Symmetry: C3
Amino acid sequence: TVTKTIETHTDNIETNMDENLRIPVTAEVGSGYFKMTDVSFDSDTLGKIKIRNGKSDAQMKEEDADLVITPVEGRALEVTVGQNLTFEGTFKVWNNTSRKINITGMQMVPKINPSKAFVGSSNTSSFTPVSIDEDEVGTFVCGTTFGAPIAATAGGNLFDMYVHVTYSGT
Amino acid sequence: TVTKTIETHTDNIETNMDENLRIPVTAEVGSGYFKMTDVSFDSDTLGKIKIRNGKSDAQMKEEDADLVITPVEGRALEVTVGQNLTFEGTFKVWNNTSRKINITGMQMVPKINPSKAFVGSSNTSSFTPVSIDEDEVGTFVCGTTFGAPIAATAGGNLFDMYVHVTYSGT
Amino acid sequence: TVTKTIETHTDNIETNMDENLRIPVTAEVGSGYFKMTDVSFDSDTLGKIKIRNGKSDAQMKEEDADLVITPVEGRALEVTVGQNLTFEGTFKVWNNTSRKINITGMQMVPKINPSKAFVGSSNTSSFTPVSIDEDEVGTFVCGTTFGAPIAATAGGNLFDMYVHVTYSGT
């Protein structure tokens, strides 16, 4: 039956939806946090995505988007703020999609500055994968530890956080 | 012809099957190896996957699964065991699937412990991609070198090994 | 309508085309550049790919391939050549495909030598994502900074550069 084959394809195509979301972030010196700016964009794979600071779970659901991302300053990562070695990028996301979504990876890339330089010290990130069911809000704990203190000088605290999102699931 | 278009879609959907398999591992202090625990799970993309320690190639094929993963302690990586800086995660896999599969990437992520901390020293992994034909067994040599000695203290030897698996192929 | 559903599937399957291109490279000591060798290969996802050194944009378009990759020695990355700590792998690509393509990631993997060893010092890469429209030529600036000087000894300057290519797009 072509009808059931097409239905199968629909499901398989959905399971094949992959995406490395790029979120520009700022390691705010003395805060232990990676800050992200409110933005709205469209992904050919994930649809409408909106980053919204300071939203409670309920407020997130009022947003018109497929996915809403809200950073959380809950200190899910232990850090000595004054050292400026480890920064937390933890955020929660509301899955306003018809299928369970999975956040399973993160990489912190130093931004190349106008002088064509970038912070090249050791860069080691960690995170806790999370699967979020339809309409639910889940938290993706993540962060990065650098081999040398982060400073705002020469755009040294600017990064692009890439988060791997997938509808596959295990 | 719709018939041939559907056949084309079937092939293309198959080629688009991507997956980052998460395998929890323990860097066993003084062994130079990342140890994995026998487990059985289902991937929306790859199907039934089973990790089975101590299996010979023949034994792997007796397992009821789409893919069988078996770690190999063959010292495919040169290491001075007492230093606890480099650990090998080499494993072989039986492809019980209808298409050549490719293992082309690996990343070792430090596990965040209950105290909300994680090993943040330099973390550099290496591996040798391998393509495995239908019913064949192939070995994926891989390992990681850390900037500081690994210790079991505070869950410092616990990691999540992510292996990139794809049906694309080059 | 099955006709329009199939058309939708065609578009979605296309958007799901993902690929981690493996390009063997040599960090040429004293040059500040990752060198790649002319090669021609086929990707189940991306099609015919050809790496061609020294080609001008016009010359790239004369090549018979879906994608043409040409390294660019334009010092898009600031480096002190004699230190051998930072190497640039910047390259441009001609998109001879029917859809806008995106180059959004890069990882530099140390090659395991015959003696079963690999350079395990800190390894931190950076890059600037680029989207390339049909028939256009775009440049993907990228590079890596190592924790210790790179040397050709024991194949210590050999790597496999993995570049993430996707038709998704944001």
